[PDB]
Amino acid sequence: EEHTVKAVGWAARDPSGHLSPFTFSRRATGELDVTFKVLYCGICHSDLHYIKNEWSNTIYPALPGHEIVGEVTEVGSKVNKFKVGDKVGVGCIVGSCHSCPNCNNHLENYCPNRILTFGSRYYDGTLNHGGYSDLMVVQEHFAVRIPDALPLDSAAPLLCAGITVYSPLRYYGLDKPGLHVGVVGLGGLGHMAVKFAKAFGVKVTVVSTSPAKKEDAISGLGAHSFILSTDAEQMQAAVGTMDGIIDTVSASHPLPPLISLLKSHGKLVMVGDPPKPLELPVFPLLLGRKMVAGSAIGGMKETQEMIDFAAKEGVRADVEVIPMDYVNTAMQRVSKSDVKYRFVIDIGNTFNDSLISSEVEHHHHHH
Template sequence: MSKSPEQEHPRKAIGWAARDSSGVLSPFKFSRRETGDEDVAFKVLYCGICHSDLHSVKNDWGNAIYPMVPGHEIVGVVTEVGRNVDKFKVGDKVGVGCMVGACHSCDSCKNDLENYCPKMILTYNSIYYDGTMTYGGYSDMMVANQRYVIRFPDNLPLDAGAPLLCAGITVYSPMKYFGLCEPGMHLGVLGLGGLGHVAVKFAKAFGIKVTVISSSPNKEKEAIERLGADAFLVSRNQEQMQAAAGTMDGIIDTVSAVHSLMPYLSLLKSHGKLVMVGLPEKPVEIAVFPLVMGRKILAGSCIGGMKETQEMIDFAGKHNITADIEVIPIDYVNTAMERLAKADVKYRFVIDVAKSLTSA
């Protein structure tokens, strides 16, 4: 006789969950599996709030499974390891990002690109190997296979480092893959939010010229004086946009709202690359002529594999790259979601799970 989910997952856990597409989160009791031979269990200290969490709890993408415990920027301290775990020990600082499983046999998995595996298992709102729901980091503890656990550098603060597990790898991976990280290059960063501000920091650490492109003129001082961008373009200013035409090797588009891509293709040099990492809710329209005439590339990129994610965190530790955060208690999460929808945060909310999640 097969075991029930309660028998398979006897470890009691608490968190906050959405129950329907209203997206409202409230205390929730659930269970996690015991620490298996390949597993790492850790106490969750902090969890970032990603824009994907907001889309997910509101079922904007039509794939929500409720109750849903969001959170895929999860960091904490190891409390237990399985007998076959050789990468981690009790007391280590670790994190879990956007995925917790994959097939491990397809071409993507064999090339350390588990993020493109057709059977990738998301950290939350997904079905695990045993048929049970995955629950994310708005919770007190986590259990994950060691393959999907990231070791944090000692010098990288957990709270400000947590968003790198999604926002960081989301911008780091396309910079590396599309060759937009070589000294002397000129990169445009479209949007200065949770992804964009981290993209500027990574780009400057790579030693390249960075221009922030935004519809908000009031972000210029922030972009240049505090984040270190070299230049700033107001996307609604036609004179500025025309003056910058044909000057960029690539653009990382971090905008999650529906927007036209045409103005930004004109900023690219011939053979330039416009890489989409934001996730608008509706399809975008694109004219082919500007792509053909400049042999330009319109591409997409989604997080990174586990090997590259560890590489990204190590790079962040070496160059002291962190997200700009606002730390909140978990009972503020619904207000934080409302503010996130209005882009009213600089630039990432991070839940202080350990200090504020005490009961459910």
């Protein structure tokens, strides 16, 4: 009888990026799906880029949001891992092929046929709409369980910003007590990198061009050290001291000074995306057996592991919780990195309020 259900979200209609209400269909709960009421959605810079057509390949209407937390309302007839009332999360992926080496190794994020939460179509040919919405539907394999111990309002950023830095900290071996890791960029990603590295027992140094970020790094986040990258004496004092660097900056910046901070066998891991190629001198990689490497989000198994780790170790994103109807103002602030350090929309308490008509009640006397 019922093949789709009605959902409501805030969506952009053109490259202005202006968000407004949008009513659309989602699939009804299939045998292996989970339907949930959205309670919080983090705001990612990718959300802004997509609604602004930054890559010239946005499909409008464009409904972003891929840091999605909520409460299960319906489970498919074959679903066993979730029950009604469970708190769940959805990140950047909602599908993959389940029969390639990456999928088979818990790396759906590197599946060549991965399906992103938005900027893509589902197997049904329907456009994928994200988490700035009241209701979400996801195949069970692509939902994670959120523990009771974890506050839901600050959990949401783990699903993209958190996993983006957790995954390479683990894969590149930058998670053992006593190591020294540098973090470049102190925005949403960078602040999660400091938090997870601290929780692993790693000594964390924030590297920044801005003297104002010293207070943020040291007093705000509890980083072990700060280097002002424009001060040559500070950069020189730190030559060859870092086991690795998580570089979160998606803007031009010089690479050689960062390679110099690395110890031999050190790893510069990029998780940001600068728009132009960067200039890589090979000799210093040879002389010190150094590397420059990349990573993107994380697979499902590790996403669940990370959530469990955060719950147990006390890791919490620093969030600014906002009503849905503030989202366009938030987007202007995100474009200036004017948040410490992530916006989270309180969908559960504010979304419907944003839809309620503000037409003043009146008799119509003038004819």
